[PDB]
Design an enzyme around this catalytic site. Structure first.
Site, mmCIF file in Angstrom:
data_model
loop_
_atom_site.group_PDB
_atom_site.id
_atom_site.type_symbol
_atom_site.label_atom_id
_atom_site.label_comp_id
_atom_site.label_asym_id
_atom_site.label_seq_id
_atom_site.Cartn_x
_atom_site.Cartn_y
_atom_site.Cartn_z
ATOM 1 N N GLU A 37 0.824 -1.198 0.000
ATOM 2 C CA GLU A 37 0.000 0.000 0.000
ATOM 3 C C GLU A 37 0.864 1.256 0.000
ATOM 4 O O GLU A 37 0.595 2.199 -0.742
ATOM 5 C CB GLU A 37 -0.941 -0.004 1.202
ATOM 6 N N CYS A 192 -12.306 3.630 -14.171
ATOM 7 C CA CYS A 192 -12.754 4.993 -13.914
ATOM 8 C C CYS A 192 -11.555 5.933 -13.805
ATOM 9 O O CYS A 192 -11.257 6.478 -12.744
ATOM 10 C CB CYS A 192 -13.575 5.025 -12.628
ATOM 11 N N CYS A 199 -16.386 3.644 -19.243
ATOM 12 C CA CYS A 199 -17.703 3.335 -18.704
ATOM 13 C C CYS A 199 -18.360 2.057 -19.208
ATOM 14 O O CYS A 199 -19.076 1.395 -18.460
ATOM 15 C CB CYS A 199 -18.642 4.516 -18.942
ATOM 16 N N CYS A 202 -17.359 -0.755 -17.174
ATOM 17 C CA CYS A 202 -17.596 -0.575 -15.752
ATOM 18 C C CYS A 202 -18.851 -1.270 -15.249
ATOM 19 O O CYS A 202 -19.908 -1.181 -15.865
ATOM 20 C CB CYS A 202 -17.663 0.918 -15.430
ATOM 21 N N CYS A 208 -24.572 4.575 -12.461
ATOM 22 C CA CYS A 208 -23.721 5.751 -12.301
ATOM 23 C C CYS A 208 -24.310 7.040 -12.869
ATOM 24 O O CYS A 208 -24.675 7.109 -14.040
ATOM 25 C CB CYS A 208 -22.365 5.490 -12.954
#
Ligand code: SF4
Length: 225
Positions: A37, A192, A199, A202, A208
């Site tokens: 991370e 995104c 899109c 997605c 959305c």
């Protein structure tokens, strides 16, 4: 789109397309999730992989990282940029060795107490490595939420940030949270995107707001000038 539909569609998407074989995804542990991370915060995954592998080989455990001289840590970090991350990484390792007996903490409070670890990162560590019920919210996740629920304010603003944290909390499930959180990061990183989001690829395209109005450029809002 209701929260239940949101997580369900993201999880189904992750199952069929989500990457689940990266080095920090195999035999996950809080230490590996944390290390990855931190490296991923300011660096692209492709660049990060070799460094992660090199770090895990040289520093199998957090205690090994703690006992190592800082100069050696910085030398191995060379090429990743944003060295403050490295300095905090070493301090955190030393804090884990000192305060927690070398066992990377598995409770939110103790994790978030580490240098270089914020609310989102602590949530990512525990959710991804132990399946603990914590939501995440970094630039990528925030973009997905802001577009889906049309949050036009600038995230740099307190009210906007809290609003986004509320949304993340609402859509984040307890069952399968490790998969949901990784999927959200993947979506914001690969689908995104800041510019011209994919899109059609997605899983949230049917609900959305930004997609319905082709207004993804408005979310999240930019810092006023
Ligand atoms: S549909 Fe498009 S704008 Fe909406 S979350 Fe998915 S990639 Fe982003």
């Amino acid at each position: 789109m209701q929260a239940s539909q949101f997580s369900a569609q993201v999880l189904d998407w992750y199952d069929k397309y989500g990457r689940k074989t990266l080095p920090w995804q195999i035999d996950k542990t809080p230490y590996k999730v944390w290390l990855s991370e931190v490296m991923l915060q300011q660096t692209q995954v492709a660049t990060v992989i070799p460094y992660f592998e090199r770090f895990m080989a040289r520093f199998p455990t957090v205690t090994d990282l703690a006992n190592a001289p800082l100069d050696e840590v910085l030398h191995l970090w060379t090429g990743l940029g944003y060295y403050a991350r490295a300095r905090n990484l070493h301090k955190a390792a030393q804090q884990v060795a000192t305060l927690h007996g070398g066992k990377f903490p598995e409770t939110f409070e103790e994790v978030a107490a580490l240098p270089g670890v914020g609310r989102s990162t602590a949530g990512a560590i525990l959710s991804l490595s132990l399946g603990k019920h914590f939501p995440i919210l970094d630039g990528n996740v925030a973009r997905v939420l802001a577009r889906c629920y049309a949050v036009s304010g600038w995230p740099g603003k307190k009210e906007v940030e809290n609003k986004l944290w509320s949304l993340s909390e609402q859509v984040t499930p307890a069952v399968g949270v490790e998969r949901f959180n990784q999927a959200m990061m993947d979506l914001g990183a690969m689908i995104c995107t800041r510019s011209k989001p994919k899109c059609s690829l997605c899983p949230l395209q049917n609900g959305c707001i930004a997609a319905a109005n082709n207004s993804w450029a408005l979310y999240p809002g930019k810092k006023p000038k």
